[PDB]
Short mmCIF file of C-alpha atoms in Angstrom, two decimals:
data_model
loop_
_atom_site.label_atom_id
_atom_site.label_comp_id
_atom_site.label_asym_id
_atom_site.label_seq_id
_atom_site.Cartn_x
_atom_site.Cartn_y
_atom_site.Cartn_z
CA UNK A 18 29.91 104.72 79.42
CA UNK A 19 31.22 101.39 80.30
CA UNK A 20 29.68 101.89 83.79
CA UNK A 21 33.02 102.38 85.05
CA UNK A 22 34.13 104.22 88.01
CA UNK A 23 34.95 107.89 87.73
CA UNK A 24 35.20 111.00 90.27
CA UNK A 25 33.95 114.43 90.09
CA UNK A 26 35.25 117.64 91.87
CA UNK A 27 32.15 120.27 93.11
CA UNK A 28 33.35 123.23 93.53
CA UNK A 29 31.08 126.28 94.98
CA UNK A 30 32.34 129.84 94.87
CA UNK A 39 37.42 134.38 93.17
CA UNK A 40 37.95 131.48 94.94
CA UNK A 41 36.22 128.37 95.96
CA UNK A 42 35.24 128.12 99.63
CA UNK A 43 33.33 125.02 99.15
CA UNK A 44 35.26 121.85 97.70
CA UNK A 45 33.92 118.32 97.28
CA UNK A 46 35.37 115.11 95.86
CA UNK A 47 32.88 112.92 94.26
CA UNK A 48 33.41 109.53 92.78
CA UNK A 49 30.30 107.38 91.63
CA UNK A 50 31.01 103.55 91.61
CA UNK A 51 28.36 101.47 89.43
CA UNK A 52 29.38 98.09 90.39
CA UNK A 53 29.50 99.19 94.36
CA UNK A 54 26.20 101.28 93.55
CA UNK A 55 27.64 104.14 95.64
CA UNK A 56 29.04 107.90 96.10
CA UNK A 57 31.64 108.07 98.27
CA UNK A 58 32.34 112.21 98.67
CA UNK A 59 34.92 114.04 100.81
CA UNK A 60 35.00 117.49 101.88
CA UNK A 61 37.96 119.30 101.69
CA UNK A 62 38.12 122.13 104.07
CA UNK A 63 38.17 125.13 102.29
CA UNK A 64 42.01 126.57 103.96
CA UNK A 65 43.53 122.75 103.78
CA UNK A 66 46.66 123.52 103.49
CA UNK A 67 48.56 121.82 100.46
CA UNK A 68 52.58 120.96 99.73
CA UNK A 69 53.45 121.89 96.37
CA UNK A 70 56.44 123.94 95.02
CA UNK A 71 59.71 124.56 96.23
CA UNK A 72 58.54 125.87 99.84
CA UNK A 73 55.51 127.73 97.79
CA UNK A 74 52.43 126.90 100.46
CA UNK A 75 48.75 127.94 100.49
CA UNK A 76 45.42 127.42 100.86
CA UNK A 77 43.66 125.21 98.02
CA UNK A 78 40.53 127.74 98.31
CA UNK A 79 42.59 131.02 97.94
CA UNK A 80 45.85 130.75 97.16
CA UNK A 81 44.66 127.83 94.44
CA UNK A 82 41.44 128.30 92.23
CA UNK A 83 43.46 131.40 90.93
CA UNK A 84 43.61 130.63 87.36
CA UNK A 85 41.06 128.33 86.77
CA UNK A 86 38.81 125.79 89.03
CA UNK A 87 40.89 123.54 86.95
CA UNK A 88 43.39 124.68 89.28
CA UNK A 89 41.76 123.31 92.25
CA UNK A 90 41.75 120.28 90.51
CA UNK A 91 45.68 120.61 90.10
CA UNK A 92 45.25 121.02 94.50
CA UNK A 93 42.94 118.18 94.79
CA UNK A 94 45.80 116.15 93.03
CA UNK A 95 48.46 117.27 95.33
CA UNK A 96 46.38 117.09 98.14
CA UNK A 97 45.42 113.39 97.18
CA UNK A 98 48.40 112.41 94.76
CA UNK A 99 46.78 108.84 93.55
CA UNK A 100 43.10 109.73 93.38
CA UNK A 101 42.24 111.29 89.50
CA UNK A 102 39.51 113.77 89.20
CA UNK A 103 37.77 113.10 86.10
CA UNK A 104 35.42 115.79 86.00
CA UNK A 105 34.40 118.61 87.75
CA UNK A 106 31.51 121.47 88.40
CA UNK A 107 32.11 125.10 89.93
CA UNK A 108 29.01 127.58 90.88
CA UNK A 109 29.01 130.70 92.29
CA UNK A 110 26.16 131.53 94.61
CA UNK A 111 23.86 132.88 91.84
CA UNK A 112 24.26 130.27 89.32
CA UNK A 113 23.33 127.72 92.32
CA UNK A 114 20.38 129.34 92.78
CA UNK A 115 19.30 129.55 88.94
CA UNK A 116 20.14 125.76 88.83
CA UNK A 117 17.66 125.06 91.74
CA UNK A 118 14.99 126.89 89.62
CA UNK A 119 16.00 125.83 86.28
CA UNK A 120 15.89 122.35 87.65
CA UNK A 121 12.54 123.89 89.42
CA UNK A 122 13.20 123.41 93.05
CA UNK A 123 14.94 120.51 95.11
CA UNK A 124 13.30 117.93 97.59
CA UNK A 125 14.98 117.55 100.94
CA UNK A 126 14.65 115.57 104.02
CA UNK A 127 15.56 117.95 106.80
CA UNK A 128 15.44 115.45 109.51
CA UNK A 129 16.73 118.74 112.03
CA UNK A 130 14.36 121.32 113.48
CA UNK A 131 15.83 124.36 112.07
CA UNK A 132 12.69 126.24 112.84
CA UNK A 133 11.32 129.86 111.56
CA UNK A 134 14.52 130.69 113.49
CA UNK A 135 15.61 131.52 109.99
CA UNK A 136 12.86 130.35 107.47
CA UNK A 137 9.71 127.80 108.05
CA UNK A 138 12.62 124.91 107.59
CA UNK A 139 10.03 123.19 109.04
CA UNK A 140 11.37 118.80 110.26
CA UNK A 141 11.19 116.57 107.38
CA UNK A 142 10.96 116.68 103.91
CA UNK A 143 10.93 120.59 102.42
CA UNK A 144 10.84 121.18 99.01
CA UNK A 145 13.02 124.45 98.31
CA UNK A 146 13.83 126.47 95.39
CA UNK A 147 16.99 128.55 94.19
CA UNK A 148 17.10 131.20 96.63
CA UNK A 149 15.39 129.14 99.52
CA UNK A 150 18.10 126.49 99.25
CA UNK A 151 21.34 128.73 99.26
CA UNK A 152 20.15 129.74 103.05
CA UNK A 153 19.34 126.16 104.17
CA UNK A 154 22.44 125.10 103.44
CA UNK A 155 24.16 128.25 104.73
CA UNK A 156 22.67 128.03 107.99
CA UNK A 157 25.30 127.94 110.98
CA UNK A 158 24.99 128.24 114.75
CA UNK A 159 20.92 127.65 114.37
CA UNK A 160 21.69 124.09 113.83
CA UNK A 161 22.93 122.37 117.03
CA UNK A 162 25.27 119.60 115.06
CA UNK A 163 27.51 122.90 114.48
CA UNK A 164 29.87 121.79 111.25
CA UNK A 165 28.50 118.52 111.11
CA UNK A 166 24.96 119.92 110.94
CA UNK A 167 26.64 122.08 107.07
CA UNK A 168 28.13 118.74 106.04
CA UNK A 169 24.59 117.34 106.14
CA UNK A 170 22.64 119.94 104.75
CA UNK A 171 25.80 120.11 101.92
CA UNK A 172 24.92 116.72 100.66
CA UNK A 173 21.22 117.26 101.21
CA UNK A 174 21.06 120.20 98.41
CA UNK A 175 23.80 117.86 96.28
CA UNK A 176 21.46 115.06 96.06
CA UNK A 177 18.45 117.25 95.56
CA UNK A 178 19.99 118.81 92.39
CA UNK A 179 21.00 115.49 91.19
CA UNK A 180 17.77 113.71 91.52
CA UNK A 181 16.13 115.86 88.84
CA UNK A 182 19.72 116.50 86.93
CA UNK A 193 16.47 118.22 79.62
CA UNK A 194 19.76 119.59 80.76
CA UNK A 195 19.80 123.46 80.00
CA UNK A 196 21.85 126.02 81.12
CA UNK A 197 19.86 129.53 81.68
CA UNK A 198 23.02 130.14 83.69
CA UNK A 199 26.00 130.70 81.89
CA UNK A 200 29.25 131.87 83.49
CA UNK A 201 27.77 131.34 87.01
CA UNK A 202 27.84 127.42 85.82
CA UNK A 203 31.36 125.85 85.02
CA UNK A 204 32.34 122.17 83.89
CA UNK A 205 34.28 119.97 81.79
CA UNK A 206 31.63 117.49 80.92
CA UNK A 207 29.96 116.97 77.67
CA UNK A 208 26.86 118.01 76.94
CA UNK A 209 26.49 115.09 75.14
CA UNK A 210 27.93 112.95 77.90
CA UNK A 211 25.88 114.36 80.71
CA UNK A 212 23.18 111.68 79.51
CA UNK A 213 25.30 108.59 79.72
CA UNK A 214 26.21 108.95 83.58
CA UNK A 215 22.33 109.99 84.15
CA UNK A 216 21.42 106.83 82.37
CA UNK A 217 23.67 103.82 83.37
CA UNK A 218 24.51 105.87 86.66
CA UNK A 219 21.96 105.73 89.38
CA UNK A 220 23.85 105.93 92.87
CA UNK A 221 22.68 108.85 94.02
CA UNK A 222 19.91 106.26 95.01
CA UNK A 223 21.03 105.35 98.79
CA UNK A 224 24.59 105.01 98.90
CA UNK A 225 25.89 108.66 99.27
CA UNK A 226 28.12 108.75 102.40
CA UNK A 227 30.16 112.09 102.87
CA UNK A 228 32.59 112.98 105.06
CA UNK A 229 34.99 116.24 105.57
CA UNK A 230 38.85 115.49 105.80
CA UNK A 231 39.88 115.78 109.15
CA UNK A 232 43.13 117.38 109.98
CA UNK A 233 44.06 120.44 112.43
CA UNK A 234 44.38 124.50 111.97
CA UNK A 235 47.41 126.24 112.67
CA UNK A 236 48.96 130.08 111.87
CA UNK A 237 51.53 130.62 109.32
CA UNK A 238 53.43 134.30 109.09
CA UNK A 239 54.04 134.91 105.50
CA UNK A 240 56.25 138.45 104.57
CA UNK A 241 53.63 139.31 101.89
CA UNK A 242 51.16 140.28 104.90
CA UNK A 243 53.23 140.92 107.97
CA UNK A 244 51.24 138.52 110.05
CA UNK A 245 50.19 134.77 110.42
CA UNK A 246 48.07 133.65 108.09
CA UNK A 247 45.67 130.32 108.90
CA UNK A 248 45.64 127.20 107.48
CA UNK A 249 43.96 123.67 108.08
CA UNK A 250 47.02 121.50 108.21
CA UNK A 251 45.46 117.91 107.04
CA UNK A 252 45.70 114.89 109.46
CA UNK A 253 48.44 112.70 107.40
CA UNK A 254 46.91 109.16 109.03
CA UNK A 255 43.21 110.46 107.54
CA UNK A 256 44.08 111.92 104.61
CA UNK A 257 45.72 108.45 103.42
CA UNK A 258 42.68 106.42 105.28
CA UNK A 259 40.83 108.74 102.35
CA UNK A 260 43.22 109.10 99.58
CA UNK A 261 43.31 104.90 99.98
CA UNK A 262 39.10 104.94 100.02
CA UNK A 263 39.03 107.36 96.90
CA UNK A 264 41.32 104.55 95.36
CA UNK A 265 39.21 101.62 96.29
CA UNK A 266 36.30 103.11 94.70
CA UNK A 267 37.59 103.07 91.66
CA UNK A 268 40.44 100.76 91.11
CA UNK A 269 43.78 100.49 92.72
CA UNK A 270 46.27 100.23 90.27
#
């Protein structure tokens, strides 16, 4: 309320296979938002190990939160949103359809994503941003479309839920109002980025094989878990 920094975790699904760390600065009138590869691996428990996606989200998406802390111990993640695939789609209806600059040719290859701006709707949007080898930037390409539908949603985000279990948050209903009042970042100042780090196998008895896991890059991770800091206030 005080126009003072906070964070958000978006989390799309059980598990969660999509996880994004939000935090909206006022005073810096920006959104700085990391992606967190879905099997990052994360260190907590007395040799316990896992993927946050999988092995985490299993008791909650408030779980993931608990792996987005242990992942990142200083940053605090002061709210956060999990969808499943059909709730996304009902909240790009609800919302009645998002607005998107597709600055890629991703041609009837799939749909008539035709280059620019393409208004989409629930259904439409849940295969743009699922789109893979059609768009030459590979994983880049997803982390671009990602934000796209995230800003389209939030640029028209009254506030009714249709949706019900496919929708899952912590924020108030009467609270919702205050960040889209005195909050408007989502202006120009959203830069993303997905955690770098590098994949290796792990055996693990339960299975009988190796199991894979995104082991994060230690010199990144800080570069972000110092960033996520800055943008709200190191102390």
């Amino acid at each position: 309320e005080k126009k003072k920094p906070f964070s958000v975790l978006l989390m799309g699904s059980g598990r969660a296979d999509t996880i994004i760390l939000a935090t909206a600065n006022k005073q810096q009138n920006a959104v700085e938002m990391v992606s967190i590869p879905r099997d990052t691996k994360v260190d907590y428990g007395n040799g316990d190990i896992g993927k946050i996606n999988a092995s985490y989200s299993n008791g909650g998406p408030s779980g993931t939160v608990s792996a987005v802390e242990k992942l990142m111990p200083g940053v605090p993640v002061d709210y956060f949103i999990s969808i499943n695939m059909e709730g996304f789609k009902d909240l790009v209806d609800a919302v009645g359809g998002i607005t998107v600059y597709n600055d890629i040719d991703l041609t009837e290859v799939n749909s008539k994503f035709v280059k620019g701006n393409i208004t989409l709707n629930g259904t439409e949007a849940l295969q743009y941003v699922r789109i893979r080898h059609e768009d030459p930037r590979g994983d880049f390409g997803r982390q671009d479309r990602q934000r796209d539908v995230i800003i389209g949603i939030a640029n028209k985000v009254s506030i009714m839920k249709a949706v019900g279990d496919n929708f899952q948050t912590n924020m108030t209903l009467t609270d919702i109002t205050s960040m889209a009042a005195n909050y408007s970042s989502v202006l120009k100042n959203v830069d993303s980025q997905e955690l770098k780090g590098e994949g290796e196998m792990i055996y693990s008895e339960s299975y009988g094989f190796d199991l894979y896991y995104f082991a994060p890059d230690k010199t990144d991770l800080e570069r972000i878990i110092t960033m996520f800091k800055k943008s709200l206030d190191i102390t």
